[PDB]
Amino acid sequence: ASAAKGDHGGTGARTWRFLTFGLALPSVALCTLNSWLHSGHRERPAFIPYHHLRIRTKPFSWGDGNHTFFHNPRVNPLPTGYEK
Amino acid sequence: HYEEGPGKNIPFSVENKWRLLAMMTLFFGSGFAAPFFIVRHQLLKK
Amino acid sequence: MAYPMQLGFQDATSPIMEELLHFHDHTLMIVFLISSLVLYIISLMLTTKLTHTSTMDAQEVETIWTILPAIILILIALPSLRILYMMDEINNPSLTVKTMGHQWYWSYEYTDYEDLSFDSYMIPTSELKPGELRLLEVDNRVVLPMEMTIRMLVSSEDVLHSWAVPSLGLKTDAIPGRLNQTTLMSSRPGLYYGQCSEICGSNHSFMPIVLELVPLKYFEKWSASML
Amino acid sequence: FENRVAEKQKLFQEDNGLPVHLKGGATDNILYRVTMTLCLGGTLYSLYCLGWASFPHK
Amino acid sequence: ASGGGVPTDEEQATGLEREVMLAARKGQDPYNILAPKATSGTKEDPNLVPSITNKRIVGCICEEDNSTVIWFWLHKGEAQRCPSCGTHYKLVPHQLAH
Amino acid sequence: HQTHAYHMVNPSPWPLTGALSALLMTSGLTMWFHFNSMTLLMIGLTTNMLTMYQWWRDVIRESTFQGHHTPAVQKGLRYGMILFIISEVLFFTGFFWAFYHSSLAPTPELGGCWPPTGIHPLNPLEVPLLNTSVLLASGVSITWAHHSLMEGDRKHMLQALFITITLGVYFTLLQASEYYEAPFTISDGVYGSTFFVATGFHGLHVIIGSTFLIVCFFRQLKFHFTSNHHFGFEAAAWYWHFVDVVWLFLYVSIYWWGS
Amino acid sequence: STALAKPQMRGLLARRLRFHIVGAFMVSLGFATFYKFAVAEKRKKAYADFYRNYDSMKDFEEMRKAGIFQSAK
Amino acid sequence: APDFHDKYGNAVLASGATFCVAVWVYMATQIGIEWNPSPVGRVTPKEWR
Amino acid sequence: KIKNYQTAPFDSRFPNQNQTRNCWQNYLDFHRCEKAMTAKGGDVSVCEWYRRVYKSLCPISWVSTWDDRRAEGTFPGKI
Amino acid sequence: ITAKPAKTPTSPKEQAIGLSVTFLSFLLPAGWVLYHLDNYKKS
Amino acid sequence: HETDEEFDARWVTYFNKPDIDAWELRKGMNTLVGYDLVPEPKIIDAALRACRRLNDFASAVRILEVVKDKAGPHKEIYPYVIQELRPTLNELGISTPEELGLDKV
Amino acid sequence: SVVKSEDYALPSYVDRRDYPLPDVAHVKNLSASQKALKEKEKASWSSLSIDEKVELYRLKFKESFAEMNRSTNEWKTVVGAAMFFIGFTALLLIWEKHYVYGPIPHTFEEEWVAKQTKRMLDMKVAPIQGFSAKWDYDKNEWKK
Amino acid sequence: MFINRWLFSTNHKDIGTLYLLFGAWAGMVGTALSLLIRAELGQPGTLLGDDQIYNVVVTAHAFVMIFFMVMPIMIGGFGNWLVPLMIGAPDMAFPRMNNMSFWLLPPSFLLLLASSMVEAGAGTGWTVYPPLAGNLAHAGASVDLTIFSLHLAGVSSILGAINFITTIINMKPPAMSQYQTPLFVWSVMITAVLLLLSLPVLAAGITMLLTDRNLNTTFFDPAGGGDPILYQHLFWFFGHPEVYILILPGFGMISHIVTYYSGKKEPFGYMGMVWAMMSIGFLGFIVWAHHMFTVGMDVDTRAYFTSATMIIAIPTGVKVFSWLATLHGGNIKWSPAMMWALGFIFLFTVGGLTGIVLANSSLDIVLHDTYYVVAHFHYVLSMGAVFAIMGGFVHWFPLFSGYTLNDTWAKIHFAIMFVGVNMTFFPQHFLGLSGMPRRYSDYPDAYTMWNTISSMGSFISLTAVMLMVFIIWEAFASKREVLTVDLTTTNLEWLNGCPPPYHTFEEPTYVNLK
């Protein structure tokens, strides 16, 4: 592809700045907007004690040995199910 | 600067052949003895 | 089984092991021929006072050095690959037997009809009966019908093992979560021994395999009596 | 900010025989000594830990 | 769109980097960055080998594309010859860094 | 007195302190994993940081302040950095191999399907797409920074480099948030294993690369770079492009194709 | 009393090489023949001869009577 | 002038060979090493059952 | 059709050394068939072939673990 | 290669000593361990 | 490349250069002995007369020794070469290594 | 004459059969009579004595070809000493058998081996070539 | 001064010396381990204990011999000493990073010794396969200590590789192309490329083993949908290029030794030697699953791995025949280094050829995990990599030290080793064909006679190793100082004398373009 833009005359900082503010940052702003639209907690699924999940072959070296490092009580059940 | 030349470009002295014999003996001998003593260590546990 | 002072492969008990022996003889001949030619040429290079130390032109001779070995490799690969695909060909087995590796023994499952399964452990050296083989005998042999295509399925319930019977040319790794397949056909009745062939911890040396090959009718009666 | 690279080039090119890791002055020596002390002490402590771990505590 | 504030090498390069840059500008090569160009290498027209001492190692690639390099010390004084191809080299000692 | 252009380095204690820091980190991890203690690990991490700090400090002293980086030296550093990046690509390649291995032949324990039964992948169109735009954008701003530096424009170099760093930090905070929010964990079978270990090492590389960019930012503030000589900047930009490209492969492979 | 004849003076090493490489070749074919006769053919004939009139039931009966089997007494 | 090998070569060869042969023969035959040779042509088979 | 079943025949879908998916697929097929039959009032006897095949091929411990997991509600394949 | 005569010649006697000491340094510790194996095992 | 005669002529010419210097004498002999051959008498004759012009008796004797050496186990070559060189040896007063006792181990 | 370590960068003397004319003379310093000899060498070599010719050779070269190519008795020392150390190794094996190894398993007892050999023959271990093939089942003995 | 020089070094010769000392010490450790192996197997029954102690010994033996003896000696030792001298460079590109590559090795070795001291050791095989190496079947710190030891050795060699590639590409005289650098230099740059590409994949695989053991990942655990066979792929993807890493610098030293003691100015067929080494390096990356012919892979995959592995014989054959063509017409000097190289050419050839036997997946079904594999790899390691190391060591010892060895003693040493290694490993082919498995502490009685002879062979090797220490002592004790070295015009590393000054090529060589 030639992408869809134009340009090339010579080369420079001015063009990359143009690209930074005229395309890259607007793209980030659009994805940021898109993301803020679909945020807000989802409807956590029924707990099923599947044996291929919530693996424990050795206690974790922190906490009570049974919580993952970035344990989120809302959405990460223990081997025995969600917390109270 | 540093010493240069035979016997001087090494981290161990070769000034005296008998002191060198002792050092080489401790050096190679410790390497060779270590597995026997680790074996002994593992047998004398359980 | 191996016998004292054995140099080569155990006698073939299956047609595929027989093929492996002739392919090995073929390959070993080439091995002997090359290693002896190298030794000879070395000695030739070293046994003269005549000298020639100026620059030597290389390209004529590098043709021979690449083409001859290329030819020799094809002469090895051709029978190697025929045998490989022969081993892979469709069988129609009459029977399926499973073996599960464990620390440190093998279990066997013959579940085509009935639920027959049992454990097979090495006979401890202090319990061998006179004439029995140290580290090779088991309490419960893997009785199988001779002259019949058998599908062996191999897995493990713990660590890796490997199920091997050299005289049938067999070696299939025993991997937990995996069902590996091989086929077994014995041309003869008798007792055929193998040993665990993947390191598996403290008693790796001491979990052997004994196949007992007998006529179908004896196998069926044995099967029935093991339920 | 002003460009003071010239002053630093004078400092680090001073003909005083110091190796580059000590050539900034007395705080280089302090940082060096802290690093080496932590490294050497830490290594002895690791050896103590191996000694400890080499024997049963059950 | 655009101003300054970034030093140039001319303003700020120092030490050996600066010596190499200043020498290159004068087409000189005190730090041996370039391969010397051969003379005909006869006795009358020897390859001239600079040195800051009274001997330097020469490697002679006798013919184009030889993979073998012929190495020998070249000493101050009369021209020496490569032991393989005979091409002449003469040492021209001294100084460096103006 | 030398008449070649290469750098004879002053005898240095940092290789030894670095090597000992590796011993303390690895014996420290062992102690943490098996003997319930973080002490050795903390010491190792500290001496490691100290070693890195002093060693690269010295490289700056040798180059900016002492002038040892002739073109021949810089050329070696270019090769060194390219080879280092190649080794890091191969390290990632082992985790992509692991991911494709498990996802292309999902085992019966998983339900024989991918994603495994009970795994609810993140929506690749939400935060992961945002992260993709963020790193791609930072690839653009770093290129702007490089050109400003070559053109001798201090203010715009600093602006563009600051934007690049901000984007690195944004990615890191977004990723930290999505780790916390993710309904699956690193103990959720081979799905969680490949996901967190691959994106986790990538995240570490983002943090390393951001740190390298921040070092460049402060060196720029102090006028270390000339419009022609700024290898630390080029090396950080190359590493930063490497981190972007690894992200794009993770996004396509794990978040999108593996969803 | 008599002069010595001019001997060959050039290519002595090359001549020696050529002669012996040819000799190495001759020996190689000679050994391949030995081997196909003494090892490979011997093996094919031992197996073919063994199986030619082999009676597997009779083999089994001998083994059974010797008491070797768990499943057959 | 005769070197070490001119003066001691013959004795080193003879006594090295004698010692080597003697001590390997002794080791191989006199100290209870079980070589486990083939029974073929050697062992008389005996009833085991 | 095929009574005098001896063992599971070659299946061109699983022609290789790794037979894990053969055991798995036949186990699934049996239980899917059984569900389809026990439901619509029909006869599980029509599921028989899959039952013979998975019984022949599958390690006892696998069948037994899968059976426990179905009972528990933790079986991850779709039946 | 050519070389100077030894600056500190090592006589046959000195060589017997260096060789004996060298062999003993390998043999004695391993020998002590293997000799005491049963002690360690049947312990 | 070149015939045997052309090679020999090259080498005769090389040593026959009237003002050949010591360096060229050594270079010629040290290169020549690298080849798979014992030099023809006419080449050795030219090298020996170069030794004469350079007032170097010892190198003449050495050249005779290297002829013997290049023959290896072919014991018939050296006595033939000496035979062919006798008029030159007589003319220049060059004693052979054997005449000087220099063939004794 | 005397070669110094500090001389490594200078052209040096070698006795090599494939480098017959080394870069320097073996002896470069000349006595009064050796200088007179070098002068005489500028005249007809027919006027040099045998001793003078030998002397000129020995100024130019250290060893003759015959001396430099001579064989030695070294092989004797090498082979003899190697067999000694090999012999010494058997002492280590004797020490090991005596002090380290215990009894081997009871299955190597002579009667056990006779029975096992028979049982191997009953099961026709390696009946095509390896083992039972060498037993004569008709004459009840090892094949001759 | 001592610490500045030996702990803070930025000098390629001194760092090379450090590596040689470290490698020599590791060699004693590896040798003791090899003796414990053969003492266990030297009579039927149990000597030490069951397979756990036994395989801790086997595993340590391999790791010590490979990572702490062969690689440090070849690459760290000879590479550091020789590569900068052979290209007229003033040092390595990254002289201070070079020092860290060295200093990572004692901690790596310490970690390996720790693994064997704690719990019951890591009795896994040097391949460290799960699940045996997992947290259930090898609970506790041992295996994690082993993984960390490998991590440090891996970083050491990766940074070394970057250093060597950069040095060799960037620091040659400006007139010298890559096709004017000596074969040993080529051998090291190719080895460094292999290291750069292969070690990071090892690092990924053992990291995933570490996380399965400690963070509840399940890369290799079927219960989480993982696969033990995945581990084997990642390991061998490294492990095959690793054996080319172990032999390539050996090939390089062999080329120099054979050229040198043949009185030649150059190896036969230089560009074919370069081609052969690059082709071997390349083919070495696409054959790894010949270590997995029994795991249950598809037949076409086994056909491909058989064929691709066998192709390696062609470029390797060019090198063997080019070594023979280098001898051809030589003024042969029967130095002890030459005996090592000649033994190398022949015994390496035999080991390569049994490698070709094993490449055939059909035959490998019966040979795999048997002593036939052990016999193959010891012909190429104990009589290939090791013979090249001994050849290089005796050849360059006078350069490194300024002193000569006693050549008679060195020849005696070669003779004893040659008998011992062949007595050790030759009968192991018979044990393999007849079915003796790997990693057994004891064997059925039929295998006794070959195991006895093999163990007696290992004692003869022990005697050679002890004699080697004495020979090095005697050289330093007697102080015979080097005077003249021949063939300096084509062996630049000798041109600065013995030992060369601390700083060499402060003034670079002069080389004309023309």
Ligand code: HEA
């Ligand atoms: C230095 C180490 C080294 C080297 C160089 C090699 C070189 C080769 N190896 Fe080896 N090998 C090992 C060390 C090495 N090996 C180790 C350690 C293992 C075991 C790993 C473990 O499980 O622990 C192993 C295992 C191993 C296996 C696995 C067997 C098994 O586990 O069942 C195989 C299978 O293909 C293999 C093959 C080869 C081949 C084809 C070569 C080739 O590169 C050899 C090529 C050389 C020649 C062929 C000789 C010279 C050639 C000629 C003279 C030309 C003419 C020749 C012909 C026409 C054939 N090797």
Ligand code: HEA
């Ligand atoms: C370089 C690698 C290397 C080397 C040299 C050796 C050398 C030896 N090995 Fe090695 N071995 C392996 C690598 C090596 N081994 C590997 C990879 C395995 C597989 C591990 C596994 O299964 O997991 C193995 C397995 C293995 C087994 C199989 C164990 C089993 O399956 O149960 C056996 C048994 O006999 C054995 C024995 C020996 C012996 C007797 C030697 C002797 O030849 C040793 C004799 C001594 C030396 C060769 C000298 C040592 C060198 C020095 C002292 C250097 C000095 C240097 C300077 C001064 C510069 N080894």
Ligand SMILES: CCCCC/C=C/C/C=C/C/C=C/C/C=C\CCCC(=O)O[C@H](COC(=O)CCCCCCCCCCCCCCCCC)COP(=O)(O)OCCN
């Ligand atoms: C944007 C995030 C950036 C990462 C920063 C986060 C902190 C942890 C560090 C991660 C760095 C990456 C290393 C890879 C190891 C695994 C961690 C993966 C990333 C991660 O952070 O994974 C977390 C688990 O971390 C865990 O176990 C904790 C693990 C911490 C222990 C580290 C283990 C040490 C591994 C050493 C490997 C050696 C390196 C190899 C060297 C190669 C040399 C050649 C995920 O959390 P969770 O609760 O399971 O799920 C979320 C549920 N809401």
Ligand SMILES: CCCCCC/C=C/CCCCCCCCCC(=O)O[C@H](COC(=O)CCCCCCCCCCCCCCC)COP(=O)(O)OC[C@@H](O)CO
């Ligand atoms: C919890 C675990 C701990 C993890 C550790 C965290 C790590 C953070 C480290 C971040 C990296 C910072 C690197 C700073 C380097 C600054 C020195 C520098 O950049 O030095 C430059 C040379 O480049 C050079 O060495 C380039 C040097 C290359 C540096 C490479 C950086 C990446 C290495 C990181 C380690 C990766 C770990 C992998 C994990 C699997 C100096 O030359 P110039 O710039 O041309 O200047 C000269 C001009 O002024 C002349 O006019």
Ligand SMILES: CCCCCCCCCCO[C@@H]1O[C@H](CO)[C@@H](O[C@H]2O[C@H](CO)[C@@H](O)[C@H](O)[C@H]2O)[C@H](O)[C@H]1O
């Ligand atoms: C695998 C490599 C090594 C294998 C070869 C080893 C050869 C052995 C060399 C000698 O080793 C010594 O042997 C002695 C016995 O000869 C032991 O003394 C033991 O036996 C003596 C007599 O029974 C007592 O006096 C001592 O106290 C008692 O320690 C001694 O401890 C041990 O060091």
Ligand code: CUA
């Ligand atoms: Cu089971 Cu080895």
Ligand SMILES: [O-][O-]
């Ligand atoms: O690996 O061969």
Ligand SMILES: [Cu+2]
């Ligand atoms: Cu391989």
Ligand SMILES: [Mg+2]
């Ligand atoms: Mg295996």
Ligand code: NA
């Ligand atoms: Na730039």
Ligand code: NA
């Ligand atoms: Na044993």
Ligand SMILES: [Zn+2]
């Ligand atoms: Zn030249």
